[PDB]
Amino acid sequence: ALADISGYLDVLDSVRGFSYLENAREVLRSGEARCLGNPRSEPEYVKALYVIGASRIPVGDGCSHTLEELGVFDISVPGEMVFPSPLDFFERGKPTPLVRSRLQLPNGVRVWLKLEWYNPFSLSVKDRPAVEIISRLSRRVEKGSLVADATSSNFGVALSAVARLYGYRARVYLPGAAEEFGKLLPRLLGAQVIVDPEAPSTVHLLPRVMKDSKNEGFVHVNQFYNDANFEAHMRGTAREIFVQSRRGGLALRGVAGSLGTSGHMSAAAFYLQSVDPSIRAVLVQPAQGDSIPGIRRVETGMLWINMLDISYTLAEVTLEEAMEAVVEVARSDGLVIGPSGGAAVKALAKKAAEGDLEPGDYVVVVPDTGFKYLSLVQNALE
Amino acid sequence: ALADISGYLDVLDSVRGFSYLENAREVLRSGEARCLGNPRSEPEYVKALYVIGASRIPVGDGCSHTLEELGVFDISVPGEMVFPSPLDFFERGKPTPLVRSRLQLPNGVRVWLKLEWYNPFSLSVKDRPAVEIISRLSRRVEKGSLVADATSSNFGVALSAVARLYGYRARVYLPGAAEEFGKLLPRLLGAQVIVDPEAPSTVHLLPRVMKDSKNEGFVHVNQFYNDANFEAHMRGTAREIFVQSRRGGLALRGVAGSLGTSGHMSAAAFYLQSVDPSIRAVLVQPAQGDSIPGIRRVETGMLWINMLDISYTLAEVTLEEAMEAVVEVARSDGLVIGPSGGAAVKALAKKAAEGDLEPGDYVVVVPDTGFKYLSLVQNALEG
Ligand SMILES: *Cc1c(COP(=O)(O)O)cnc(C)c1O
Ligand SMILES: *Cc1c(COP(=O)(O)O)cnc(C)c1O
């Protein structure tokens, strides 16, 4: 039988560790889940179901229910696109668009672009971890409390908007080289902003944020380590790629993406490889020396991409090469993508040139809009 | 009986003038269109149906069909949000979102925000006129031809993107006061940009564009005069406000917005007042001396708002007041609207205070995202 999962989400408070993902993987591979005589007594299984996108759980003895029956494939979006609040629109105005590009790559590699700027608060992929993180402290941490993090531009904006929505205050710490929109827009949204001119990277701010947290008593949400980040992308970004590829008739042979926190691509890889382990994940490595906003090299410390059982391929991409792809996609599709989106397109283009990819449909996650990066666009047209 | 309108759309090539809108208004008012014996002999009636958003026409002798049967309400975004091309995404990734605000206005005036930054190319309301203009010359004008116009930032970006999707080249003329994204992003999109530092406004550039058009032989698409702008907003923005209000359970009592070309608010007013003449159109007048990007005062010259049978009220709004609404919406809703969106919100707030408006639901058209306007945001926070 079917019950609403909403009544069992306290298991998100109490399940720890990655062992529950064995259940997620097996439910996805088999396309079904076994009924729980006592759902309460199997919290890891309930969490597995939530993380893959189920809105319902199977209840009883001996029965089983399909992904479909569990609500994994339920249509979210009202046909008329009317929403009673911005949060409801974040939650139900999904999937984010998946749009076939007319970019021509060698070897039958067809490019689709997933447009994560379609998230309303930060115009970026970062809404999803912000919502998930804030919503799940929202029972134990007191309203009016300060939450904070080290961030590049997008999550600081996401965090500021979402914290306030849920009744919290936000503080955002950014390196000197962050874009001005990351420094300014959080203030518009009601947050405090701290820029460290000296910090050479976003993760270099983390020790200061942790020290300040101990002295000042604010909640350090730590997107780089907070599993709700990964889980948000499992139930959202990754579930969407899966459902979109199926209902859209793609022959999904891989995904391509970039890595900051590693949240969105680790989820994409893990989810899709659960259904079909041969699906490739092609991932961007900002070339040494270069800085591409929002993203980093794997060696500098990433949680999910390293700890989870996922196969991926790297590809080196310079800032110059990423911006060339931004120009190519703009001239080809009339779509203005961000530097990191361009990096992911280029990575896919390289692996396509090398003959490494089966012909078929490949989904590139585009983290944000290129409108935000006028100085990088200016340099790229020279 | 019904026939697909696709087989009758050469009327768009041949019909001229505004007389056809009489038919559009009556069909919307009665909520039904009557069958045509020979549709080919009634091209104005066919155009009327295309412009209000019908996908089918009524065919027969004596019969009639509702807006619903005609496909006017058949604008559903697909549940899976998968689009086999960018143009298909522009076409089918609609309606743009209509989101209830928590802004508190006096006298029972409830605010809904229509987010036109959800257009795919220029992230603005201007994609819609760009696509309709270019698609409808995409037959008669030879590929590789140059298309051009005088513009503020948004339509320059939209024109540039759309031109390339239909196999044209683009040139964009902007005044010196235009935003940097307007000067730069068309070049990313492959277009030529001409900036006139001295030009005090966008419409001041028009004589020079027209002169250059005569000399160099490019198509001046002229958004300020081209009826496909109005028509795009009739079948897009306006039809969406109508259909979204109905299906969404709103008690629609008015729309608020701003004027550049006057394309989108003239359409919203004309379409909705066709259905119900008591629906108000509250329009922004940028206070004398001030410049709100993308928008103008009625007196400086406008086509559809003056020629069409619509009612509206004007509210004066300073740049400062427009930006105060941007701050307020950001703090209330967590959404960042543009200066002209903020102005429309303020125009609605002002009218609401004056006791002028029926209590109920009001849709504010938000032309773009305020993410772009960082200097104006900076200045606004200093207060
Ligand atoms: C956060 C972000 C990324 C990387 O996303 P994660 O899910 O942190 O790995 C890439 N690009 C941009 C612009 C971002 O904001
Ligand atoms: C075009 C535009 C307007 C006005 O729209 P029209 O349909 O030209 O009257 C308002 N604001 C912005 C930002 C625009 O680009």
Q: What are the residues whose beta carbons fall under 8 Å from the beta carbon of A328, sequence distance 6 or more?
A: A103, A345
Three-state DSSP at A256 gives: strand
Q: Which residue has the tokens 């970006």?
A: B157
Residue type, B235: R
A154 is in an annotated binding site: yes
Residue B262 in contact with ligand 2 by CB distance below 6 A: yes
The CATH number fitting domain A78-126+227-382, selected from 3.30.300.90, 3.40.960.10, 3.40.50.1100, 3.60.20.10: 3.40.50.1100
Cα separation values, B347 from A182, A250, B21, B365, Å:
30, 47, 28, 12
Tokens 């009592």, located at residue: B253
DSSP per-residue letters across A8-72: GTTHHHH--SSTTHHHHHHHHHHTEEEPBSSGGG-HHHHHHHHHHT-SEEEBSSS-EEETTTTTT
In the numeric block, the tokens 């019908």 are attached to B54
**Cα(A317)–Cα(A295) distance, integer angstroms:** 12
Collapse the DSSP code of B34 into the 3-class scheme (helix H, G, I; strand E, B; otherwise coil) and give the result: strand
Tell me, using a 6 A CB cutoff, whether residue A370 lines ligand 1: no
Q: Which residues of A touch B377 (CB under 8 A)?
A: 184-185, 188
Class of domain A1-77: alpha beta
Q: Is B103 on the interface with A (CB under 8 A)?
A: no
Residues near B48 by beta carbon (within 8 Å), at least 6 away in sequence: B20, B21, B22, B23, B24, B27
Q: Which residues 170-189 of B are in CB contact (within 8 Å) with A?
A: 180-181, 184-185, 187-189
Flag whether B260 is marked binding.
yes
- Residue B93, chain A, CB below 8 Å: the answer is yes
Angle at A152 between CA A151 and CA A156, to 5 degrees: 60
How many Cβ atoms sit within 10 Å of the Cβ of residue A195? 15
Q: Which CATH number fits domain B127-226: 2.60.40.10, 3.40.50.1100, 3.40.470.10, 3.20.20.70?
A: 3.40.50.1100
- What number does the ligand 2 atom closest to the CA of B341 have? 11
Whether A78-126+227-382 shares its CATH topology with A127-226 is answered yes
Q: Phi and psi for A340 in degrees, rounded to 5?
A: -70, -30
What residue's CA is closest to ligand 2, atom 4?
A: B260
Helix (H) or strand (E) holding B316: strand B313-317
Integer Cα distance of A114 and A367 in angstroms: 8
Contact (Cβ atoms closer than 8 angstroms) between residue A75 and residue B79: yes
Q: Which residues contact B211 (CB under 8 A, 6 or more apart)?
A: none
The CA distances from residue A211 to A84, A170, A207, B87, in Å, are 40, 17, 6, 51
Q: How was this structure determined?
A: X-ray
SS (HEC) of B259-310? CCCCHHHHHHHHHHHHHCCCCEEEEEEECCCCCCCCCCCHHHCCCHHHHCCC
| Residues linked to residue B36 through DSSP beta bridges, in sequence order | B59
Q: B163 and B137 in contact (C-beta within 8 Å)?
A: no
Give me the DSSP letters along A262-311.
SHHHHHHHHHHHHH-TT-EEEEEEEPTT---TT---GGG--SHHHHS---
The string over A19-57, giving b where at least 16 C-beta atoms fall within 10 Å of a residue's C-beta and e elsewhere, is ebbebbbebbeeebbbbbeebeebbbbbbbbbbbbbbbb
β pairing state of B2-4 and B56-58? antiparallel
Helix (H, G, I), strand (E, B) or coil at B20: coil
Distances from the Cα of B305 to the Cα of B201, B226, B302, B308, angstroms: 20, 13, 6, 6
Is A145 labelled as part of a ligand binding site?
no
Rounded CA separation A168/A161 (Å): 10
Resolution, expressed in angstroms to one decimal: 2.0
Pairing of strands B219-220, B146-150: parallel
Mutual orientation of helices A180-188 and B374-381 as an angle, nearest 10°? 40
In degrees to the nearest 10, what's the CA dihedral of B104, B325, B121, B5?
50
Domain ranges of chain A: 1-77, 78-126+227-382, 127-226
Cα end-to-end distance, chain B, whole Å: 62
CB A148 within 8 A of CB A130: no
Q: Is A17 exposed, middle or buried (0-12, 13-18, 19+ CB in 10 A)?
A: exposed
Q: Round to whole Å and give the CA distance between A83 and A96.
A: 16
Structure tokens at B325: 């609404």
**Ligand 2 atom at shortest distance from the alpha carbon of B129:** 7
List the structure tokens of B14. Answer: 């041949």
Q: Does residue B367 contact residue A367 with C-beta atoms inside 8 Å? A: no
Q: Which of B170, B161, B168 is nearest to B191 (CA)?
A: B170
Q: How far apart are alpha carbons B323 and B308 in whole angstroms?
A: 31
Question: What architecture is the B78-126+227-383 domain classified under in CATH?
Answer: 3-Layer(aba) Sandwich (3.40)
Which residues does chain B have within 8 Å of residue A363's beta carbon, measured at their own beta carbons?
none
Return the amino acid letter for B353: A
Q: Minimal CA–CA distance to A75: which of B19, B82, B308?
A: B82
CA distance linking residue A368 with residue A379, whole number of Å = 19
Q: CB–CB of B235/B261 below 8 Å?
A: no
Task: Specify the 3-state DSSP secondary structure of A140.
Answer: coil
A261 assigned ligand-binding residue: yes
Q: What angle do CA A326, A248, B118 make, to 5 degrees?
A: 50
Token duo for residue A43: 């919290």
- Asked if B276 and B310 count as a contact pair (C-beta separation under 8 A), the reply is no
Q: Which residue, chain included where needed, has tokens 């989106």?
A: A341
Q: Give the gyration radius of chain A's Cα atoms.
A: 20
Atom from ligand 1 closest to the CA of residue A129: 7
**Partners of A219 in the beta sheet?**
A147
In 3D space, the residue among B94, B140, B89 whose CA is nearest the CA of residue B115 turns out to be B94
A278-to-A357, A359, B241 alpha-carbon distances in Å: 11, 13, 46
The count of other CB atoms within 10 Å of the CB of residue A71 is 17
Interface contact flag, A82 B250, Cβ < 8 Å:
yes
To the nearest 10 degrees (0 to 180), the angle between helices B374-381 and B319-333 is 90
CA angle A125, A128, A131 (to 5 degrees): 140
Cα separations in angstroms, B204 against A117, A381, B140, B225: 35, 29, 29, 14
- For B:19-58, CB contacts with A below 8 A are none
- Backbone φ, ψ for residue B303 (5° rounding): -80, -75
Question: How far is A346 from A325, CA to CA, in rounded Å?
Answer: 6
Grouping H, G, I as helix, E, B as strand and the rest as coil, residue B353 is helix
Contact A307, A270 (CB under 8 A): no
